[PDB]
């Protein structure tokens with residue numbers, strides 16, 4: 001059951017919306033989350049319709065960015081786009097990736113400043129991460145616990161999550177919280193052990209390709225994807241920033257009091273291995289912007305390399 005449900009579960013989180021777009025320069029809509037028109041401020045077919053031109057959802061200037069982005073040799077290099085809904089001029093980060101049927105566009109509301117205040121957030125993010133990487137590189141060697149303690153302190157500073165932990169997989173695949181930074185009125189999870197089966201093999205496997213996963217609100221009602229009747233299976237959402245969590249895990253989050261989460265792979269060699277996760281929790285809803293998630297992502301690559309070095313060294 002799990003892998004196909006996670007890969008093609010037909011649902012996204014309601015803080016954003018998702019389009020699937022033809023990859024042939026027509027920009028025809030192949031699919032859209034049912035909330036797309038509402039989130040785009042779009043109350044003779046409606047602009048959010050199967051086969052309609054996705055470019056006509058956005059300002060004319062936005063459309064020109066989508067064309068370059070789709071035409072580029074490597075789509076991820078322009079992520080995220082800064083674009084505007086046609087009618088309302090509502091701004092979004094657009095994150096684009098390719099799948100079997102076309103291009104998936106994840107649309108995350110940006111919180112409206114001027115573009116220079118917008119640039120300052122993104123700038124400070126990328127530099128906050130290089131700073132955290134160099135603070136890790138400044139650490140004396142042969143001390144993994146100190147490396148882990150430092151990562152959680154920086155990640156908490158960056159993200160503002162109530163709780164940030166390093167979760168290490170033991171050989172038998174059960175996990176242990178081996179480092180923790182949290183606001184001091186929260187019960188610590190540091191030193192707690194959790195069964196292997198809390199994180200199915202499918203979830204652990206997917207973290208190799210999908211290194212960063214954010215859930216805004218475990219209680220939010222997952223949003224259905226409307227798709228072309230010609231598509232023979234549910235849209236591949238495995239790479240979506242907005243993919244809705246499996247119902248079991250949504251309930252696990254609510255039982256744990258983690259209303260919001262940010263979870264990130266710790267990758268090493270062995271032959272690349274998932275050694276652990278950096279797990280972030282919030283006791284209320286939270287969805288930090290993409291550029292800050294991108295920052296953590298390259299911090300976690302950096303963390304992974306230093307960690308692997310310190311390992312393959314006892315080895």
Ligand SMILES: *[C@H](C)[C@H]1/C(=C/c2[nH]c(/C=C3N=C(/C=C4\NC(=O)C(C=C)=C4C)C(C)=C\3CCC(=O)O)c(CCC(=O)O)c2C)NC(=O)[C@@H]1C
Pocket residue numbers: 002006175177189194197198199200203213214215244245246248249252261262263277279
């Ligand atoms: C449901 C019957 C079973 C189940 C399924 C399940 N679990 C996940 C994913 C995760 N589980 C996590 C567990 C923890 N989070 C913590 O903070 C701690 C401990 C302090 C644990 C042990 C984590 C992390 C994940 C990753 C989630 C993420 O944010 O990506 C999934 C996959 C959900 C998805 O949609 O990707 C599933 C199906 N969990 C259970 O407890 C029961 C047995």
